[PDB]
Amino acid sequence: VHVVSRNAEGVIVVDGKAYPMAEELVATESVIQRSIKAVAKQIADFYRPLSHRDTHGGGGVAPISDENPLIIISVLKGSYIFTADMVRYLGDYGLPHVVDFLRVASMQLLAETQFKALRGKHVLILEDIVDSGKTLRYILDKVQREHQPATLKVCVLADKPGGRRVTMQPDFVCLTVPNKYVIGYGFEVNDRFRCFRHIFTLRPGEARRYPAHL
């Protein structure tokens, strides 16, 4: 049970910790973790019945297994904490899977996947948030063209449906967030706030608090 209050300075306090950069609390760790574990069950239930290219035994089609696992591509740097939690829940539900990473920046690709045999494989992208939809459209087109997967789906921790600029509907969504700048649980302002266990909205203008390049 989380204790949420405001101190005399009007600042949000969660379990004794003050968040002076926060406007509102979106989700506590308990709510976030329950939502991720629920989507993990959905992903495991959806993929465990499926089959795809057998690269372990030289063809043809074979069930998703430890021999031929679901391929997960995690988008760095935003999705690493979400990914770490999600994979452990996928393991709890017994879904065979392997994870590789691509790195994008604001588009530029900074780091490519090292996986080289995704042709005819079921591929799932783990992403932090779908807001405008532009980042995912860039990643999806790149992965489809270079890897030619059997299927390509997207699981996001957060959906901000009010921010869309292009058509993007993830296949799996853990949480819906307000039409505001969110921080915490991987969400950042110049790499700050990613380690928070809860998700908050940012006080307006605080997005410029750390102008110095790291």
Ligand X SMILES: O=c1[nH]c(=O)c2nc[nH]c2[nH]1
What does the binding site for its own copies look like in residue numbers (CB under 8 A)? 55-56, 58, 66-67, 69, 71, 76-77, 80-81, 83-85, 87-88, 90-91, 96-101, 103, 105, 110-111, 114-117, 190-192, 194-197, 210, 212-214
Of 131, 159, 171, 191, the active-site residue reads 131
85 binds ligand X, rule: CB under 6 A: no
d(CA 128, CA 96): 22
State which amino acid sits at residue 172.
F
CB count within 10 Å of CB 153 equals 17
Partner whose binding site includes residue 214, from ligand X, its own copies, none (CB under 5 to 8 Å by kind):
its own copies
Which has the closest alpha carbon to 181: 156, 155, 208? 208
47 SS3 class: helix
Partner whose binding site includes residue 116, from its own copies, ligand X, none (CB under 5 to 8 Å by kind):
its own copies
DSSP labels, 113-164: ------TT-EEEEEEEEESSSHHHHHHHHHHHHHH--SEEEEEEEEE-GGG-
Whether 85 is a known active-site residue: answer: no
Nearer to ligand X, 160 or 198 (CB): 160
Q: Which range binds ligand X by CB under 6 A, 37-45, 58-66, 89-97, 180-188?
A: 180-188
Partner whose binding site includes residue 129, from its own copies, ligand X, none (CB under 5 to 8 Å by kind):
ligand X
Q: Are 149 and 120 in contact, with CB atoms under 8 Å apart? A: yes
Partner whose binding site includes residue 56, from ligand X, its own copies, none (CB under 5 to 8 Å by kind):
its own copies
In the complex, what is the shortest distance from the CB of residue 164 to its own copies, in angstroms, rounded to a whole number? 28
d(CA 199, CA 57): 44
- Residues near ligand X (CB under 6 A): 129, 131, 160, 181-183, 187-188
Question: Which amino acids are annotated catalytic?
Answer: 131
